[PDB]
Amino acid sequence: EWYLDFVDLNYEPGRDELIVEYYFEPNGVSPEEAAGRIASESSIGTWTTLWKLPEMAKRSMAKVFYLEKHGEGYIAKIAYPLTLFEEGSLVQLFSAVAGNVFGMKALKNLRLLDFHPPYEYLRHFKGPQFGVQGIREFMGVKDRPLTATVPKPKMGWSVEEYAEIAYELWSGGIDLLKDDENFTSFPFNRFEERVRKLYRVRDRVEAETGETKEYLINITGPVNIMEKRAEMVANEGGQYVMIDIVVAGWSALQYMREVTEDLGLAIHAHRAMHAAFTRNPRHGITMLALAKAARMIGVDQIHTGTAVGKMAGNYEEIKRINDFLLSKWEHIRPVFPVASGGLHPGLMPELIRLFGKDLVIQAGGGVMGHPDGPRAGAKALRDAIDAAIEGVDLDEKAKSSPELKKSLREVGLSKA
Amino acid sequence: EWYLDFVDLNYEPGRDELIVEYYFEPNGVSPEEAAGRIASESSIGTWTTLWKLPEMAKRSMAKVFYLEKHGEGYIAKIAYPLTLFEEGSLVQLFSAVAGNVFGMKALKNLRLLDFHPPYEYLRHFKGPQFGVQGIREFMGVKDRPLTATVPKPKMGWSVEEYAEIAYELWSGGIDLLKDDENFTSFPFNRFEERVRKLYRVRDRVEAETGETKEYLINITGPVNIMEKRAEMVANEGGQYVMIDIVVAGWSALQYMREVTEDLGLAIHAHRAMHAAFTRNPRHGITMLALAKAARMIGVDQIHTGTAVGKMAGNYEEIKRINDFLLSKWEHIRPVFPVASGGLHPGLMPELIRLFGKDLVIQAGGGVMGHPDGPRAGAKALRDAIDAAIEGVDLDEKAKSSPELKKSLREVGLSKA
Amino acid sequence: EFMGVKDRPLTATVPKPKMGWSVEEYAEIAYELWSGGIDLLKDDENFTSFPFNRFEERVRKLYRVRDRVEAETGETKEYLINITGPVNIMEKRAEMVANEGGQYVMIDIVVAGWSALQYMREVTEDLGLAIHAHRAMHAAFTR
Amino acid sequence: EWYLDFVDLNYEPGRDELIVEYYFEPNGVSPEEAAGRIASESSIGTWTTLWKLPEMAKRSMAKVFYLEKHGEGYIAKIAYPLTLFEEGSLVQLFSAVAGNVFGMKALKNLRLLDFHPPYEYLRHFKGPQFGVQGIR
């Protein structure tokens, strides 16, 4: 019942234990009794008094085994014995470590920084199912990064209107059609009538080109539907499906891992809604924490960020989160980072050079925005990237790629 | 493509439109071009240039029709035409209004304050399914508030250990056994073996007492399981099921509405994880926003807060959020607020007097904490409440209720 | 009839070491083995399903490697894969091996148990699956 | 590939490991190279030579960490790292520890004596369902 028992700065935690690192600021408590309480809460809570103490209560405790001070507050690292989790249910994990823990009156601020799972906890998660690898195999791109475009405007397109601009985009060299996070199903573009259409356009284009083309379609919605729509996307044959992991919810992603197990569907995530906590640096959940829970259940792409005036994104953090996603990790296969952030033909070389050929560059803007129309906007971006990778001067590339020249030349006429 | 078209402070929005009120602080933009962008983002995003504009793009726009300044920033109120939602999928609603909207570089802070749904959007939501009403009918309590206890410690109890203390708690007068937000299923207390047990204990106690007793059991976990466990709780007969709405996820709650439709299961929500955004007053999502999305899909109880030194909770906000939950609202039946916050026999009268007999008072502590053991702790709390309601002086009540006296007398020996 | 060998004996290899290979690592050495002239990939009696080589992800892979190799060679190639485990799973995994097309499935008859083999006869009836047995555990009495 | 690497009488095995105690009689091998082989067999078998060694092969090893002599033979106790089992499938467990292990030519006799499962292996088993209790 003593938040202090929950701390011991000396303790050494074993291979088979769960560690969560926290950022906090007490608020009328010793930095010890704050960090005590974070592990009271996240595990057997309190009480040591009246009724028969539960056997295994005693072994179910959490323990602060490091609390140094950092910035205007401190970092604790609390280690957790696995009798506290239900292995497999990452959703249950969070109830203890992302719960009431953020409400507790004794803290001014509390942020979840990162967490590491003992094999024994993580060998129960399938990891991505395609990873950078699988994805890579199937579309057919061994080296460059993957290119993908959400079309502007972002809604109200009809089933028809949608095919057309899809067709254009795939046609100049885009890899991935991306729907917009918001865009699911509407009277004028119903899901079912949509799938039926695009897929056929999709193939006609493989046929037309020689290259592969996929559509990160947006199955977000109550699980039932998300399932029902996945079974259709599987039907006309897509090896992909876009899901708003933050929106959509946890329990619900899980389930969907399994479903994509089943149909052989590559998940793409879209953090649209994360900004509600992954932002404030004193409180919340680090975009990394989350890029992890979720690489573990198994998403095969996630939006992280960029290298562009538009997303002036902490390149230290952006490269942390990235490098993780891409890193080995036992059995869990590597994820693709998704470069979202108003990018365009000219930012290619620096983007790359700063984040590896292993990216899904997403640049809706720089492409719909081409002066010559979306389809030369995709030739652009394509060339802008072939030439980056092969070393070649963007100004040289331009000398053979006219939609590249005019895109370069044009993005010139916009900044003064 | 002009964040300004997205504003018009003059506009008047019709019955059949969707209004979201925001709190924000620009960050290198006019308070107009900030609030322009919040409705660029939350609806057809940008662009008015190259390819065929989508018909209905034009009618799918959002519009700031009020932006006064408030505190160190401003309040916009953006109104939304329904061609933008997929009616029914509240989860899709949030992708537009709780999305990327919190990430946009031009704001320092952005908070979702409240939202109102035109009949036409809300007539597609079932509301609670039991509401204060149904719940009230079934347990059998027409007047007092409902009492419920999570047992301390909060984990590692065995299937057995659990029955016993359950038995005790129901036995002094508790209405609701509550599991702990964290507590699902574990080697030593597996779900299935748990349900089987408690229910029988539950009834034995109805039999023993004359009163009703239920168990807000905790079906949180991936949807599949949450479903599978709901079907069992339905099986041995419970009209209740506890779910961590914030954890668990949105899409996933939805689905579960429907499932509880089916089995005739009353949902109880537990915001454990909300503190990640519902806290910071400049950024996030107001506990009210959320108490709404979720009364609408239909939870029949939610944790809000209190009137006690322990949760020194903005009584203006706590009473907002409450009063809402309890308020008429067409077709949506009223929700019960859940009073969580280390409360105990002596805070009863003031608690009440400040929040109506219509509460589910949750006080795990004040009850397990009784000096005489948990079961007289429930007599306490019971009496503490009968006497509050009937006017009677707590010191008078004590004169006939010994476990009340000794609890009053004892909570005396703790504050100096 | 099916593998295609009317006269010689059938050749088959369990790879050393016998565990901890990944879904990947496994394809590669499979590929090699089929490639010099092996008929049968054999799993090891112990080798079923593990975090780093899960069954389902395994089947999907190898089979494709299997065929690529038929294509590459001109000869047939099969994989005495190891569906041992509680019946339910053994069934569920047989239905997949059937799925990507294998006419074989390795089972530890002594381990696995009797009642359980039986049932599986019938299941392989059904999918058209050739059983291979592995007496690993018999030495407890047959000695 | 050295049955000897599979032994170390000094080693100390952790909470999260699996121990099987054996009774045996070698038969043309040191009581060490007999008990080496019992853990070669029951885990990554053999070979350290030609093709790419599998990553986790190395961590999937078993290890004799006690072999005293007992009766006309000896008792080894081999401890096993869980990357070798498929948790839940006790049937798979036995293929490694009750397998070919009883056939190996280098032993005259081999008996499985007892085994202890680390929580982490046993928390995946439901135990009886009624026990003396329920029945009762």
From Swiss-Prot, chains A, B:
InterPro entries assigned to the protein according to its UniProt record, in alphabetical order: RuBisCO, RuBisCO_III, RuBisCO_lsu_C, RuBisCO_lsu_C_sf, RuBisCO_lsu_fd_N, RuBisCO_lsu_N_sf
Disulphides: none
Organism domain of life: Archaea
Cross-referenced HAMAP family: RuBisCO_L_type3
Similarity comment: family membership: Belongs to the RuBisCO large chain family. Type III subfamily.
Top-tier EC class: lyase
Protein name: Ribulose bisphosphate carboxylase
Alphabetized PANTHER family for the sequence: RIBULOSE BISPHOSPHATE CARBOXYLASE, RIBULOSE BISPHOSPHATE CARBOXYLASE LARGE CHAIN
GO biological process: AMP catabolic process; carbon fixation
Claim: Magnesium is one of the keywords in the record: yes
Catalyzed chemical reaction(s): 2 (2R)-3-phosphoglycerate + 2 H(+) = D-ribulose 1,5-bisphosphate + CO2 + H2O; D-ribulose 1,5-bisphosphate + O2 = 2-phosphoglycolate + (2R)-3-phosphoglycerate + 2 H(+)
Family annotation (CDD domains): RuBisCO_large_III
Residues that coordinate or bind substrate: K154, R271, H303, S340, G341, G342, Q362, A363, G364, G365
The species this protein was found in: Pyrococcus horikoshii (strain ATCC 700860 / DSM 12428 / JCM 9974 / NBRC 100139 / OT-3)
Residue numbers carrying N6-carboxylysine: K178
EC code: 4.1.1.39
Gene label: rbcL
UniProtKB/Swiss-Prot annotation, chain C:
Modified residues (N6-carboxylysine): K42
Binding positions for substrate per the UniProt entry: K18, R135
Active-site annotation: K16, H134
Binding site for Mg(2+): K42, D44, E45
Domain of life: Archaea
Function in brief: Catalyzes the addition of molecular CO(2) and H(2)O to ribulose 1,5-bisphosphate (RuBP), generating two molecules of 3-phosphoglycerate (3-PGA). Functions in an archaeal AMP degradation pathway, together with AMP phosphorylase and R15P isomerase.
Similarity-based family: Belongs to the RuBisCO large chain family. Type III subfamily.
Subunit structure comment from the entry: Homodimer or homodecamer. In contrast to form I RuBisCO, the form III RuBisCO is composed solely of large subunits.
Note: Because the Archaea possessing a type III RuBisCO are all anaerobic, it is most likely that only the carboxylase activity of RuBisCO, and not the competitive oxygenase activity (by which RuBP reacts with O(2) to form one molecule of 3-phosphoglycerate and one molecule of 2-phosphoglycolate), is biologically relevant in these strains.
Entry protein name: Ribulose bisphosphate carboxylase
Gene: rbcL
